[PDB]
Design a protein around this nucleic acid. Structure first.
Lengths: 170, 336, 107, 336, 336, 108, 107
DNA sequence: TACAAGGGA
C-alpha cells in the first residue's frame, strides 16, 4: 500500500509443522496472487496488517485445506517512512481459525457475505478491528461491537449472516 | 512548589466528554472498564468516565483566563487567547505572540521565556523536534468503587432525545425536498459519585529542561530564564486556575448541561520538593492510605503541609481544616 | 428457538424505516451482568410496542408482530436457572446480535 | 459582567418539557436518574426534570423580546423575530436580517456586529465553519434531594385524560366514516421543589473570540466591534431576559398548563472579573458551601457583590437583601 | 396589551371536569397531587382540581359568544358557532367559513384575517404545517394551600348517588330482556377555596407570527393585516370574554350542578409592553409577592396599571379598587 | 406457581387494542416498584379497573377477562411478606410487569 | 385466614349482581393515611351490612358472611402498634386488595 | 499523523 511517499509492505509465509504432500503444496500455491499493487486511497485499511490479510483471505477460495492439517503463518511489515526502511512488526499468531470462521461464515450465501465483509472493512475500520480481535481471541462482545459499528454507518447486516454468527458462537 | 490533590466530587445529569460519533445521531457518552471486588472474584464493570485530556485542556483554559489579567500577560501565544490547544502543530516553525510578534521555535529557553502556555503545559514541535513535558498531570474522572459496588449496575446512564424546531419563513415544516432541519437527536447523561486526582509540578516552571542548572559559583543554582516576579505570577495563575476547576468548568455541553458539582471531600499536600503522588479517590479505602502516606512521609524527614476537607484523616497530625477549594488555593498561594 | 421472533421485534427498533432509533435499550440489554438488569432492559424494549405499531400503521407497511405469550414464559423458565453469568452471556449477546439483523419489514 | 444565579423554586401541576409521547396517544414527561445519598447508602431514583436546552431557548426568547424595544433592535436575525431557535443550519451561506438585509457568514466580527442573538447565544454554521461559543450556560432543573428524602418519591406524577371533540355540521361524533378526530389523549403532570442555576458570562458581547484584545502599545484593552452603547444595550437586554423566566414563562404547554411556579429562595453573585461558578441548589447543604465559597473568595480580594432572597447567608458576608427578581435585575443593571 | 389576573375564589357543590368512570354508574372528579410544607416537611396530597385546557375552552366559548354581536363577527368559523374547538384537526385542507365560503390552510395571514378564533386561540394545520401559539394561557385551578393545611385532611369529596328513571309505556320497569334501562349512577362533588392565575397577551391580535414587524424604513411598524377597527373589536371581545369566567359559567354538568360560585379576591396587572406574570394565589404568601413584583417593576421602568378586589396590597402603590370583575373588565376596556 | 401468568393476562387488558383504555401509568408504576408497598398499591390500581373492562368486553362482543382468583391474590400477598429483599423484589416486579405487553388474542 | 373474611365482605360490596356499587368506601380504605382513617373506612364498609343482609334473600342466592367478632377485635388490637404510615399503607392495601377478586358470592 | 532514526550497491 502506497499512501504517498511512504509504503507499507506486508509479507506472509505459510508454514507446516507436521507433514505435507504435493497436493497440499499446490493448494498453498494457489493462494499466491501476482501484482498486488493495490495503492489507491479508498482502500486505506491495508495498514493494520491483520486487516490486510483478512481482506486478502476474503477473496481467496483455493481450498479449505488446513481444517484437517495444522498450519501457521509468519508475518512481517516493511515501511518507507521518510526513506527510513525498517521492520516494526513481528507478531506470530496462526491462520487456521480465522479462515475456518470465515468459511463457516459463508455457507448461507455470498451475495450478502463478500459485500458484508467489504463494507465493514471500508466503512467501520474500528468495527472491523473489533471483529478481527473477536475472531482471534473468541470473545462474545467483539461480534456485537462489530455488528453495531457496521450497522451505524452503512452495513445492511442480513439475517443469514446473523444466523451463521450465532451458529459459530455455539 | 509541588502539590498533589485527591478527592471525591458528586455529580448528576452530566453529558461530559462523549464520543459524539457512531454515524449521525445518538451522541453517546464515553465509558471505561474498571476492576472491582464485589465480595467474589475480581470483576470488570463498564462505567461512565471523563478523559484526563479534557481536564488538562480545561486547566489550560483556566490558567490562561487567570493569567491574562497579570501584567505579564503579553508573553502568551496567540492561539492561547483563542483557547486553542494546537501547540506547534505540523509544518510551522514559528509562533505568533499575543501582541503580533513572532517567535522562532529553535531553542527551549526562548520559547519558555516568551510563551507562557508552552511553559506550564509543555509543547511539541515536530519540525524542529523540540520537546517539553507538561508540568500538570491529571487522571480520569471515574466513579468510586464502593458506589459502583452498591448500585449493582443500573447502567448509570439515561438517554434524552430532543429535536430542532427549524421551520420555514412561511411557517410550515417542509419535507426533505423543501429543506428543513427538523430532526431528532439523543444525548446520554450520567450521574454518580466520582473521584479525581491531579498533580502539579510548579517547581520547574521557567526552567528549561535541557539545562536546569548553570553552576557559576559551584552550587546547583536553578536556571531561571525569566524574572522571579514573572515566575511567581505564572505559579499563582496556575494555582488559581483550580478555582474554576471544581466549580462546573471541566465538562462539555455547558450551554445545555452545566454539570452540577459539590466536592464532598478531598485532601491536598504541598511540600515544595519531590513528593509521591497521593492515592486516587476512586478506591474506597483511600482515606487511610493517604493518612499513612502523609504521616510516615512527615516522619521520614520531609516537610509536607496537608489541607483536608470533610475527612477525619488521623487527627493526630498537623492538618489544616480547609472548607473550600478556593480557600485551599488561597492557603497555597499565601505560602509561595 | 423463540429467538427469531424476539430478534425481529428488537430489530424493529433499529431499522431506518422506523425513524426513532432506540439504541439505549439494545445497548443496555446487550451489556447485562445478572437477571434483574436484563429483565428490566427487555421490559423497556417491549414497552415501545404501541409507538412501533402506530408508526407502521400510519406508514402503510404491515404492523410489527409482538412476541407471542406462548414463548414469553419460555424466557423466564429458562432464565432463572442461569445462576452463572457466563452461560447467560451467550444468550445476552445472541439476542443483541439478532436485534441487528436486516429483517425487511416495510417493502 | 459575570453573573451566577442559583436557587430553589416550587412547581405544581406542570407538564413542562414532555417527551412528546413518540408515536403513541400517551404523552410522557421527561425522566432522569439522580443520585441520593440516604442513610442506607447511595441510591439512584428516576425523577422528572427540565432539560437545560429548553431553558436556554426560553432565555433567548426573553432576550429577543426585551431587545425588540431597544432602538438597536434592527440588528437581529429574521428567524429571531419568529422565535426560531435554529441558527445557521447546514447548507446555508448567508443570513436574513430583521429588515431584510443579507449578512455574509465569512466574518465573525460582522456576524456579532449586526446579529445580537448570535452575539449572545453563539452560533454555528457547519458549512463555512464560523463559530462562537454561547455566553449563557443553563443547568438542568431537578427536584432537591431532601424533597426526595422525605417524600420518598411517590412517583411525583399524575395522568389526566383529555378528549378531542370533532362535531360535524349535523352534530355527530362519527366513527371511521366522516374522518372525525373525536379521540382521547392524555398528559402527565408533576410537582415538587426543584433547583435552578444560571451562568451569564456577559463579558464577550460585541467582542470577537478570535481577537479579544488589540494591544495597541502592549496595553491590554477590550476589542469591541460596535459602539459601547450597543454593547450596553445588549447587557441590559440579557439582564432583563431573566424576568420572563422567574415570572412563570418557563416550559411548554403554557396555553394549557401554565405552572404555578413560586420562587422559594435564591442567591446571586456578580463581578467584573472571573469568578467561580455558584453551587447548584439541588443539594440540601448548599447554603453553607456557598457561604464559605463567597467568604473565602472575598478574602482573596475579588470585587464581587452578593444578593440574597429568603437566605440568611450569615452575618460575616456583606449581602444586600432583595424582595423580588426584578429588583435583583435592577440592582444588577445599576452598576452597568 | 398584556394583562394578568390572579386571585382566590370559593367553590361549593361542584362536579366540574371529572375523569369519567366509564359506563358503570360512577363519575369522579379529576384529582391532582400538590406539595405543602405543613410544618413537618414537604408532603404530597391529592386534591380535586379542574384542568386549564377546559378553562381555555370555556374562554374560547365566551369569546365566540361575545364576538357574534360585533359587526365584524362574520369573519369566523362555523365550527366555533356550535362551540367546537376542533380548529383544523388532522387531515384537513380547507376550513369552511361561517358565511359559507372557504379558507385555505396555508397563508397564515389570510387565516388570521378571516378566522378570529384561530387568530386569538391559535390553531394547527398538520397537513401543511402552519401554526400559531395561543394568545391566552390558562393555568390549573387548585385549592389554596392554607385551606389544605387548616382542613387537616378530612376528604371533602362526597359521592351523591342518583338514578335514571326509565318508565316503560306500560308504567313498569323490567330488565334488559324487556328493553328497560334502570341504573343508579354516582357523581362526586367538592367544595373549598381555589385559585386562578389566568394570563393573556393581546398585543399580537391580527399580527402574523411569521412576520410581526415590517421595517419599512428601519422603524418598529407593526404588521397589521386587519382593519384597526376590527382589531379593536377583537381585543374588546377577548377582554369581555372574562365576564362568564367569574360569574359561574366554568365547569361541566352546569345543567344539573351549576357550582355555587363566588369571587373572594383577585389582583390584575395590565400594560402594553412585556411584564412579569403574577404569582398564583394558591400559596399563602402570594399577596406580598405580587406587591413586591408590582413595586419593583414600577421602579424598573414599566408602565403598569393595577386593579385589586378587596385587597389592601400594601401601601404607596397606585392601585384601583374594583367592586366586581365586570367593573375590572370595564376599566380594562376603557383604556383600549 | 402459575398465578404470575394469570395476573399478567389480567394486566394485558390495560394496554391491548380493541379496548380504547390505555393506562400505561399503572403498568409502569408496577414495573418500577422499588418497594413492596408501592407494588401492592399499583396492583390495587390495576385491579380497580376490573368492572369497566369486564362490562365493556361483553359490551364489545369479547370474551370476559380472566380476573385473578382469590388464591392468586393470597399468593401475591404471602410472597410480598416473605420477600423483604429489594433485589428479588425488583426481578419479581419486572416478572409480573413483562406479561402486560404481548400478542394476547383477547378478542378472537 | 382472618383476613380473607373481611376481604370477602368488602368484595361483597362491588361484584357481579348486588346492585349497590360503593367504590368510594373501598378507595377510602385503600387510600387511608392514618389509622383512624382506616377506622372510619371500615366503619362505612360495615354500615352497609343490613343492606346486603336483607337484600340477599330478595333474589334467593345464599346470604353473605358478616365478619366475626374475634377477627374484627383482632384488627382493632393490631391498630395501636403501627406508629408509622409505612406499615399502615401495606395493611390498608392488603385489606382492600380482596375487594376486586373473583369471588363466588352466591350462585 | 504529524518528525526524526536506513538499508544497501
Amino acid at each position: 500500500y502506497a499512501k504517498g511517499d511512504t509504503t507499507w509492505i506486508h509479507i506472509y509465509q505459510i508454514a507446516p509443522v507436521e507433514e505435507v504432500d504435493m497436493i497440499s503444496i499446490l493448494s498453498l500455491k494457489d493462494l499466491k496472487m501476482h501484482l498486488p499493487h493495490y495503492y489507491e486511497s479508498n482502500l486505506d485499511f491495508l495498514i493494520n496488517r491483520r486487516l490486510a490479510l483478512l481482506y486478502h483471505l476474503l477473496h481467496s477460495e483455493a481450498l479449505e485445506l488446513f481444517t484437517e492439517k495444522e498450519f501457521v503463518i509468519h508475518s512481517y511489515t516493511l515501511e518507507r517512512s521518510g526513506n527510513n526502511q525498517a521492520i516494526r512488526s513481528f507478531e506470530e499468531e496462526e491462520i487456521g481459525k480465522l479462515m475456518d470462521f470465515l468459511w463457516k461464515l459463508k455457507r448461507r450465501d455470498f451475495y450478502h457475505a463478500i459485500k458484508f465483509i467489504d463494507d465493514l472493512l471500508k466503512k467501520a475500520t474500528e468495527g472491523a478491528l473489533a471483529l478481527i480481535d473477536a475472531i482471534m481471541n473468541e470473545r462474545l462482545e467483539g461480534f456485537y461491537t462489530a455488528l453495531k459499528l457496521g450497522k451505524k454507518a452503512g452495513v445492511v447486516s442480513s439475517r443469514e449472516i446473523v444466523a451463521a454468527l450465532e451458529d459459530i458462537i455455539c | 512548589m509541588y502539590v498533589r490533590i485527591s478527592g471525591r466530587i458528586r455529580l448528576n445529569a452530566h453529558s461530559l466528554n462523549a464520543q459524539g460519533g457512531g454515524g449521525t445521531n445518538y451522541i453517546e457518552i464515553t465509558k471505561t472498564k474498571v476492576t472491582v471486588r464485589t465480595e467474589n472474584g475480581w470483576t470488570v464493570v463498564e462505567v461512565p468516565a471523563i478523559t484526563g485530556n479534557m481536564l488538562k485542556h480545561w486547566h489550560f483554559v483556566g490558567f490562561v483566563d487567570y493569567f491574562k489579567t497579570t501584567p505579564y500577560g503579553v508573553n502568551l501565544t496567540e492561539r492561547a487567547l483563542r483557547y486553542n490547544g494546537t501547540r506547534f502543530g505540523q509544518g510551522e516553525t514559528t509562533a505568533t505572540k499575543a501582541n503580533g510578534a513572532t517567535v522562532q521555535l529553535n531553542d527551549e529557553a526562548t520559547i519558555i521565556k516568551e510563551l507562557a502556555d508552552a511553559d506550564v503545559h509543555g509543547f511539541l514541535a515536530p519540525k524542529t523536534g523540540r520537546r517539553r513535558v507538561s508540568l500538570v498531570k491529571a487522571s480520569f474522572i471515574l466513579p468510586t468503587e464502593d458506589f459502583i459496588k452498591e448500585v449493582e449496575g443500573e447502567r448509570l446512564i439515561t438517554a434524552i432525545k430532543h429535536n430542532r424546531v427549524d421551520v420555514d419563513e412561511k411557517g410550515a415544516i417542509g419535507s426533505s425536498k423543501e429543506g428543513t432541519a427538523q430532526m431528532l437527536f439523543s444525548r446520554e447523561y450520567a450521574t454518580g459519585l466520582y473521584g479525581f486526582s491531579i498533580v502539579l509540578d510548579l517547581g520547574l516552571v521557567g526552567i528549561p529542561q535541557g539545562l536546569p542548572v548553570k553552576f557559576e559559583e559551584n552550587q546547583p543554582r536553578p536556571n531561571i530564564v525569566i524574572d522571579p516576579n514573572e515566575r511567581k505570577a505564572r505559579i499563582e495563575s496556575a494555582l488559581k486556575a483550580l478555582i474554576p476547576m471544581l466549580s462546573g468548568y471541566i465538562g462539555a455541553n455547558l450551554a445545555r448541561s452545566f454539570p452540577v458539582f459539590k466536592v464532598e471531600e478531598l485532601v491536598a499536600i504541598a511540600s515544595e520538593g519531590p513528593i509521591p503522588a497521593l492515592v486516587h479517590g476512586f478506591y474506597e479505602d483511600y482515606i487511610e492510605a493517604n493518612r499513612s502516606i502523609i504521616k510516615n512521609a512527615r516522619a521520614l524527614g520531609f516537610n509536607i503541609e496537608v489541607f483536608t476537607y470533610n475527612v477525619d484523616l488521623g487527627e493526630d497530625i498537623e492538618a489544616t481544616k480547609v472548607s473550600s477549594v478556593e480557600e485551599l488555593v488561597a492557603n497555597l498561594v499565601k505560602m509561595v | 428457538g423463540w429467538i427469531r421472533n424476539i430478534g425481529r421485534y428488537l430489530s424493529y427498533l433499529v431499522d431506518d424505516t422506523f425513524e426513532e432509533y432506540a439504541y439505549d435499550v439494545v445497548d443496555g440489554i446487550a451489556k447485562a451482568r445478572t437477571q434483574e438488569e436484563l429483565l428490566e432492559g427487555v421490559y423497556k424494549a417491549l414497552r415501545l410496542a404501541p409507538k412501533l405499531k402506530k408508526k407502521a400503521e400510519s406508514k402503510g407497511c404491515p404492523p410489527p408482530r409482538i412476541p407471542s405469550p406462548e414463548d414469553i414464559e419460555a424466557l423466564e423458565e429458562k432464565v432463572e436457572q442461569l445462576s452463572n453469568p457466563k452461560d447467560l452471556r451467550k444468550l445476552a449477546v445472541s439476542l443483541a446480535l439478532w436485534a441487528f439483523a436486516s429483517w425487511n419489514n416495510c417493502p
